[PDB]
Swiss-Prot record:
<dbReference type="GO" id="GO:0070453">
    <property type="term" value="P:regulation of heme biosynthetic process"/>
</dbReference>
<keyword id="KW-0053">Apoptosis</keyword>
<feature type="transmembrane region" description="Helical">
    <location>
        <begin position="24"/>
        <end position="44"/>
    </location>
</feature>
<dbReference type="GO" id="GO:0005789">
    <property type="term" value="C:endoplasmic reticulum membrane"/>
</dbReference>
<keyword id="KW-0812">Transmembrane</keyword>
<keyword id="KW-0256">Endoplasmic reticulum</keyword>
<protein>
    <recommendedName>
        <fullName>Transmembrane protein 14A</fullName>
    </recommendedName>
</protein>
<dbReference type="GO" id="GO:0031966">
    <property type="term" value="C:mitochondrial membrane"/>
</dbReference>
<dbReference type="GO" id="GO:1901029">
    <property type="term" value="P:negative regulation of mitochondrial outer membrane permeabilization involved in apoptotic signaling pathway"/>
</dbReference>
<feature type="transmembrane region" description="Helical">
    <location>
        <begin position="79"/>
        <end position="99"/>
    </location>
</feature>
<dbReference type="InterPro" id="IPR044890">
    <property type="entry name" value="TMEM14_sf"/>
</dbReference>
<dbReference type="Pfam" id="PF03647">
    <property type="entry name" value="Tmemb_14"/>
</dbReference>
<dbReference type="GO" id="GO:0043066">
    <property type="term" value="P:negative regulation of apoptotic process"/>
</dbReference>
<dbReference type="InterPro" id="IPR005349">
    <property type="entry name" value="TMEM14"/>
</dbReference>
<keyword id="KW-0496">Mitochondrion</keyword>
<keyword id="KW-0472">Membrane</keyword>
<comment type="similarity">
    <text>Belongs to the TMEM14 family.</text>
</comment>
Length: 99
């Protein structure tokens, strides 16, 4: 008759969260890479309407509204990364603009 049981699931959950990348938001740079991660990870098969920067902005706006980049209480911390990301994206792509 196992005793622990929970402990196992406990540590499991611990390593689970720890492992999985963090959500972020507070930072900006991280918010940028993220937005870009979606831009790509998505673009993978995002194909359909043949978008381009639509995802960039649309995203920045999405995540923005998600976290709270929009007009709110903050010292330009949480936000910035969002938009800054959208740009770093359209640019990170405009670089090759071949794919």
């Amino acid at each position: 008759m196992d005793l622990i049981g929970f402990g196992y699931a406990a540590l499991v959950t611990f390593g689970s969260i720890f492992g999985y990348k963090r959500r972020g938001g507070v930072p900006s740079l991280i918010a940028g890479l993220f937005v870009g991660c979606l831009a790509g990870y998505g673009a993978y098969r995002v194909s359909n309407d043949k978008r381009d920067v639509k995802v960039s902005l649309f995203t920045a706006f999405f995540l923005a509204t998600i976290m709270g980049v929009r007009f709110k209480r903050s010292k330009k911390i949480m936000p910035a990364g969002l938009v800054a990301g959208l740009s770093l994206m359209m640019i990170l792509r405009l670089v090759l603009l071949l794919l």
